[PDB]
Design an enzyme around this catalytic site. Structure first.
Site, short mmCIF file in Angstrom:
data_model
loop_
_atom_site.label_atom_id
_atom_site.label_comp_id
_atom_site.label_asym_id
_atom_site.label_seq_id
_atom_site.Cartn_x
_atom_site.Cartn_y
_atom_site.Cartn_z
CD1 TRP A 284 20.31 -69.07 -33.23
CD2 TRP A 284 22.03 -67.63 -33.20
NE1 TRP A 284 19.79 -67.80 -33.26
CE2 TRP A 284 20.82 -66.90 -33.24
CE3 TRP A 284 23.25 -66.94 -33.18
CZ2 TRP A 284 20.79 -65.49 -33.26
CZ3 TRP A 284 23.22 -65.54 -33.19
CH2 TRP A 284 22.00 -64.83 -33.23
CE1 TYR B 173 18.82 -63.51 -37.37
CE2 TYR B 173 20.94 -62.49 -36.97
CZ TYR B 173 19.58 -62.38 -37.11
OH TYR B 173 18.94 -61.17 -36.93
CG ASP C 172 16.03 -67.51 -31.98
OD1 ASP C 172 16.99 -66.74 -32.20
OD2 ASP C 172 14.91 -67.11 -31.58
#
Ligand SMILES: Oc1ncnc2cn[nH]c12
Length: 282
Positions: free
Chosen positions: A218, A222, A238
């Site tokens: 993640w 990101y 997410d």
């Protein structure tokens, strides 16, 4: 007062709304008609202010005296933060119906990759609000105040966060692991192992990025998305995304998103901002 151009439409309300929620107290100042924040390029420090002129689709940038020498790099940073290069006609054409809602949706970038990396980590298993609150404490503790603008503090520099006591950052509200990830990130920035600009091969780079302690899938995705402004990255892990895809596992969501290639990053934003969004059937 410099000027940069952008191609309509540009949903500015959504953009400042996005930054306002993630704005770190005593770093950024977000309002309805402008954006401003402290900024350090080497030993050059100051305040950058961005004022959009919707009618003339031109963004006016103001720099305090301490940044004039590196004005150009300051302008470059603002352009990446606001995604001025985006061609909405192309993106919306490929996205189709998905982007029909708000065609002025832009990819929020950053002003410095090392900072964003720090934010991504701090955004781990925590809400936007909690994240901002945490990032403010970290900046408050390890940040430097601007002499000419006492109300502003610069985001902590790599050097400072490299010598920060793990426990010190811990006390601010994060596990030791998290605090060690940051410390390592700081040294990676110092050495130049952390790509400050988007790499030619994103997947490879992300792969390498995850070999870092405390950096998961993640965080990696990101970071690439905001930190490098990669346009084809989705976040199947997410938490909000899971809400949008009830029952579907990360792998299934990842399979579903392939249909938005090569603009999954823009797809991710629209899904994030469509409340009653839900998948198809087939
Ligand atoms: O760590 C995290 N993993 C997945 N989604 C989110 C959202 N915020 N923080 C997250």
């Amino acid at each position: 007062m410099y000027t940069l151009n952008w191609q309509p439409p540009y949903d500015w309300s959504w953009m400042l709304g996005f930054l306002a929620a993630r704005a770190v107290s005593s770093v950024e100042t977000v309002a309805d008609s402008y954006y401003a924040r402290s900024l350090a390029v080497g030993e050059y420090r100051g305040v950058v202010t961005a004022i959009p002129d919707i009618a003339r689709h031109t963004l006016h940038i103001n720099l305090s005296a301490g940044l004039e020498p590196v004005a150009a790099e300051c302008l470059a940073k603002m352009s990446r933060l606001f995604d001025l290069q985006c061609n909405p006609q192309i993106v919306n054409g490929a996205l189709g119906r998905l982007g029909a809602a708000r065609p002025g949706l832009r990819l929020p970038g950053c002003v410095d990759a090392f900072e964003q990396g720090v934010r991504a980590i701090l955004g781990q298993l925590v809400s936007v609000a909690m994240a901002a609150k945490l990032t403010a404490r970290v900046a408050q503790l390890y940040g430097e105040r601007l002499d000419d603008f006492p109300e502003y503090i610069c985001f902590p520099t790599p050097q400072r966060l490299a010598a920060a006591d793990p426990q010190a950052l811990k006390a601010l509200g994060m596990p030791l692991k998290r605090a060690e990830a940051l410390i390592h990130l700081a040294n990676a920035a110092l050495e130049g192992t952390l790509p400050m600009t988007i790499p030619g091969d994103v997947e490879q780079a992300m792969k390498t990025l995850q070999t870092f302690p405390g950096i998961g899938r993640w965080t990696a995705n990101y970071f690439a998305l905001r930190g490098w402004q990669a346009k084809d990255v989705f976040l199947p892990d997410d938490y909000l995304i899971k809400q949008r895809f009830p029952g579907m596992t990360p792998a299934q969501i990842r399979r579903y998103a392939e249909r938005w290639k090569p603009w999954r990053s823009y797809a991710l934003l629209h899904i994030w901002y469509t409340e009653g969004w839900q998948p198809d059937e087939a």
